[PDB]
């Protein structure tokens, strides 16, 4: 009666049976302990009792069909060189009785987890057709721990919590801070992806993969039953999804194991993805390391404002010529030249600047239509000079679009935008979409959101240019299909850190929680970490040492890097600014070697086309003692590598700048005791010797 | 105290002051007679996120007033007159609010014809960004006066009119509101603007808006017990009614005023109140349009506009036509097309409409489909550049159809393409739509964030040197004059109506006091062969009209774009009536509003543009209508060759709607004649100035 599938080391087995009143059931064990308790699959319908809204139960199956998949692809950029797509497969044709038609649930099963979606074939019987609610389950065998965040239709920007699933229900209206858009859904509503820790050692991630022509999963916790439930984000309506057979629905997943580096190391994801659609990929699309005009407003030392003479701005009526500038418009020709400077004279790809475009005096929570043109400069802003001196000396400028969240606006001038930056040489932007949603009703991750944003990233895509948008939804492994969307904020970044500051744990958490779908822009290296110095009303402390900065760049997986502290804070620490420098973007290799989530995460990661080596460790309020082992080195091989650890006084809060840089040669025989402090880490740049010279008055570390 | 302003004629006399409590108060009376009892002006803004910041209705100190005098003429690019007088005095009051420590201003505009009033927001530190909660503008009527109205709805004005005393409305609601795919009526005493109304005392009253651009649509709702009309905006999709940023204004609230029927359509109060033109070049492209179409086939179901049936849904770019059986019923077919267009060339007319000629018309109707239509792919028998070629080389233009399914973000995302398809392939004028109901989801056609679209996609013609004409659009309030590309709209009942039932009798002798007051309506008229069952078996529904009256309309519905809507099989069988339609002008030098009564009758006489011709056309209601027409508008000492077109004895719209007659004579400025309009009949005329003896031979005086 029931139906078995096997993940293909046999360690996971899915159980499917339809129950005595027609619902489709599916359960989950791994190495024979339960991950996922019996838990029914389905969803109801808007009526048009009606007996069409039922899509849930009275379902008999006709038809199940196995299959089994292995083929290795590889991504355009990523964690590793070659990804394999290897799972046994078990569709279910479900037939509704009372409503003459059927539906199917594809299950996927791999030896890291299971995913699962519904499929809505074109019939007679199920054509257009509205969805009021999904009805996922996903029924825990205990009050597991999680790291959470809560429910929310607009902003994920919130900081972690980590407690009992029990807890949760308590802890939810402190951990709801505010924000200038978000809309909670539940006193035990959370985000995905979501992680865990179960009581019996194992490491369970919830979360969706795909997420298109669709609204996006929340899930809601039943905190009596420990059972996890599909929320779907409304419309303006309160509907949850207008459909149209023959369409899918995104998959979700279960990720499971009893080592959480596993948890890390699987793409399930990315895999359940539809292949690259773009076909020259390979040929534009490529990493960015960046610096840029920014942490100057972030902090408030400087502005995005031309002038503060201005109780209002009408585009096209306002003449800035005639206004006052106010003196902190960071955004002027000079000082962008400045950064360009320096970027090349580091190495650096591009140069983001934003506050460059007319209208930034009215940005912020005005629920404003006709906010932004996207291509008029303000009079201190040279395009041109800038485009040329950029391009002189081997720079590219990132454009800034950010739209205020006012979303016909940005539709209604996207394709001029777009050919603004084709012709000025900008092949990159970064989008943003601060406030309330515009159409007003609509929120952040709604189905017609996604739509946007989607439709935002393939029209890029026909520009040749790559996307990176703040306060969209997070990612669901899209970028396979679109690997131009070379990121995403969608998280609580650093520029919290200048808004009161970030967790000390939260960057060992977002690897395991946000970074699964897709790479997050998390802007990462600020050395100065008292904000007071950029501006004297900001009393805000980045949460971080210098040296576990420096791991960001190895631990927050990302083909975006921003070194995003100021150029005259780099050359205070120009000797550790070497290894943000040094660091790769892109990589052939990525092995994961300590992973606890909430205590600490080291990397260490292969750089493409190389053999040189980059290893970060990132740790919570406790620190972190780690004894590697670079045996993944290869053998007969020397190295140049350069530690940069925390001293032994370092400590986040009281001396975050105390770090140590020693260089010596390393081997495949190699170890080392490094410890992280109080919100600490290292980075490590292990470069193959390629010429004797190199060693040259070195000793082995 | 209170502030005084009177009409250039002292007939109206305009009373303002605020009461006791700081609230806007004006009064109208006309040639002494109340028009308007004591009302009062405001808003009420949404509460932010002090309190008494949503007061803006009272607490008002009158700060300053400022008068003065305008007397322009101004030309249109297309009218019922060539020279349009502008003529007022005006009222100023600044409004101080001590409380909020801002002011406002309310502008007063007093014509011999009627009052315009509109609210101003200066720019100012305690009053930039504000969201309306509702907008109390009132109307104070003097009495249970007939009104000729519709239902309030924020979605549709395809209804049919009622004619009741104002207590009558609130029982007689229900009924009134008969079934569309899209509609949301407000109120049970809730209804649309231009209101039309009759007293007692023998005054005309028309209450309607003028200039609605950034703003959302005012309906009417009357409190039944003082009998007060009062603003009743269109609520977005969470309720509330206006997003404003100072500075700003309202648009303008007029009542138009007469004691004769006549002057409330001979009034441009409207149009005056408009900004001047704002295209330019407008003259050297925007034109008149007289057309027929591919069309009464698919509403009267005879024809299609789906390619195919034997799909349960369509998705554009992975439907593949070419491969779909075709059901037979295909009207948007290149030879069909070929036959309409030497039909269109061979009798004068300027263009041929089209519809169904595009993908993805098998699910166009009630799906909320987002990605519904690409406004560029035609169907496998829709040959677009064979079409473009012959229809050019015949001289004729083919009219773009862009039906949106009231898929707004779609229609916007393909706009630029649309308009570039349109330009690449030879066609300078559009016809849109917007059935069902509105996406964004919870969106109403009439609220701010359509007003925005439907402007936006005329501005954006205007670039492309297109011409608009938008159906199921928020009805007209004077816009044309400021954008004269957007030569139509629907946004009332039509004749596609008439194959649904029928439209009342008297529909065409209401529409000219109401719905065209603002702007032309694209009305369809032309139906020669009234029984829509001969088009399609299963249709019963039976035009309320006989033949004269029908080319009556192209007289007594003003609009610079006409069709002929009837198919050319029944115009070839009605060859001598259909004349009037082929000579019949579409813009005008002058127009003499002869007689009017709102749901009776309206008789209409036009001098076309250019030419010493005249046009003259009579519509009337079920109780018919005889006229003692008097030609002294004609020149002195010339001779016209006049034909006219008659309802014969008996005719009649139901029993004998085919029956007419046709005379011809000579006529002069001393000429006078008796005509009589069947129930549900007129009558039309061509009176031509003799431009040679050898027109006069055999023709003798009438
Ligand atoms: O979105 C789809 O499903 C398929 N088509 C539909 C048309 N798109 C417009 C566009 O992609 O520019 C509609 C949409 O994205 O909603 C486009 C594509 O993605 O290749
Ligand atoms: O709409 C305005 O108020 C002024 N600008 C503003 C930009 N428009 C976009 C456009 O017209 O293409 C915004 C809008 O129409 O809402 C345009 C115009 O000349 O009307
Ligand atoms: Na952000
Ligand atoms: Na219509």
């Not at 993944?632 to 530690?643: C, E, R």
Request: proline share 4%; charged share 25%.
């Amino acid at each position: 009666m029931q139906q078995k599938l096997t993940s293909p080391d046999n360690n996971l087995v899915m159980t499917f049976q339809v129950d005595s009143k027609g619902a489709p059931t599916y359960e989950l064990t791994y190495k024979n302990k339960v991950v996922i308790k019996p838990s029914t699959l389905g969803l109801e319908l808007k009526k048009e009792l009606d007996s069409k809204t039922n899509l849930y139960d009275g379902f008999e199956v006709k038809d199940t069909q196995t299959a089994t998949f292995d083929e290795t692809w590889q991504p355009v950029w990523g964690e590793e060189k070659e990804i394999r797509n290897h799972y046994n497969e078990l569709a279910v044709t479900l037939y509704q009785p009372m409503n003459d038609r059927s539906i199917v649930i594809r299950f996927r099963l791999f030896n890291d987890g299971l995913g699962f979606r519904y499929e809505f074939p074109q019939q007679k019987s199920l054509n257009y057709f509205v969805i009021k609610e999904e009805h996922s389950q996903f029924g825990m065998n205990g009050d597991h721990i999680a790291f959470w965040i809560p429910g929310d239709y607009d902003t994920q920007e919130y900081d972690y919590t980590i407690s009992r699933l029990s807890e949760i229900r308590g802890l939810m209206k402190e951990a709801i801070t505010p924000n200038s858009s978000q809309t909670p859904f539940s006193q035990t509503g959370v985000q995905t992806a979501l992680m865990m820790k179960t009581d019996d050692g194992l490491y369970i991630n919830l979360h969706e993969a795909a997420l298109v022509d669709y609204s996006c999963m929340h899930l809601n916790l039943d905190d009596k039953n420990m059972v996890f439930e599909s929320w779907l984000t409304p419309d303006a309506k309160g509907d949850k999804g207008y459909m149209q057979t023959p369409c899918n629905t995104p998959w979700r997943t279960i990720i499971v194991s009893d080592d959480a580096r596993n948890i890390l190391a699987s793409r399930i994801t990315l895999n359940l993805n539809e292949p690259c659609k773009i076909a020259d990929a390979a040929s534009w699309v490529k990493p960015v390391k960046y610096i840029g005009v920014w942490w100057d407003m972030i902090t408030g030392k400087g502005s995005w404002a031309y002038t503060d003479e201005l109780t209002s701005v009408k585009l096209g009526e306002t003449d800035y010529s005639k206004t006052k500038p106010n003196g902190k418009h960071s955004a002027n020709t000079a000082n962008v030249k400045r950064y360009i400077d320096f970027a090349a004279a580091h190495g650096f790809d591009a140069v983001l600047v934003e506050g460059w475009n007319e209208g930034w005096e009215d940005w912020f929570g005005n629920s404003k239509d006709y906010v932004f043109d996207f291509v008029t400069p303000y009079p201190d802003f040279d395009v041109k000079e800038i485009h040329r001196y950029a391009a002189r000396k081997g720079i590219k400028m990132m454009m800034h679009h950010e739209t205020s969240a006012s979303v016909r606006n940005y539709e209604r001038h996207m394709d001029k935008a777009y050919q603004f930056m084709a012709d000025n040489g900008y092949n990159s932007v970064k989008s943003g979409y601060v406030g309330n949603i515009i159409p007003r009703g609509e929120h952040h991750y709604g189905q017609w959101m996604n739509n946007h944003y989607l439709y935002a990233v393939k029209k890029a895509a026909d520009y040749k240019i790559m996307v990176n948008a703040h306060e969209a939804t997070r990612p669901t492994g899209i970028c396979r299909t679109y690997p131009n969307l070379i990121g995403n904020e969608s998280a609580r970044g650093t520029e919290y850190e200048s808004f009161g500051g970030n967790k000390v744990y939260h960057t060992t958490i977002l690897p395991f929680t946000r970074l699964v779908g897709g790479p997050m822009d998390y802007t990462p290296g600020i050395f100065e970490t008292h904000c007071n110095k950029m501006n004297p009303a900001n009393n805000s402390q980045v949460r971080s040492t210098i040296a576990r900065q420096l791991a960001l760049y190895v631990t927050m997986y990302s083909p975006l890097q921003m070194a995003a502290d100021i150029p005259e804070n780099y050359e205070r620490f120009m000797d550790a600014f070497q290894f943000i420098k040094d660091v790769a973007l892109d990589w052939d290799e990525t092995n994961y070697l300590e992973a606890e989530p909430g205590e600490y995460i080291t990397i260490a990661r292969k750089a493409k086309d190389t053999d040189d080596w980059y290893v970060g460790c990132t740790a919570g309020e406790n620190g972190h003692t780690s004894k590697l082992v670079f045996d993944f080195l290869t053998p007969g091989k020397q190295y140049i590598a350069t530690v940069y650890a925390d001293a032994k006084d370092a400590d986040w809060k009281e001396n975050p700048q105390a770090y140590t840089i020693k260089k010596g040669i390393l081997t495949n025989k190699s170890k080392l005791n490094l410890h992280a402090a109080n919100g600490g880490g290292y980075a490590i740049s292990i470069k193959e010797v390629k010429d004797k010279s190199e060693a040259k008055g070195l000793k082995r570390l």
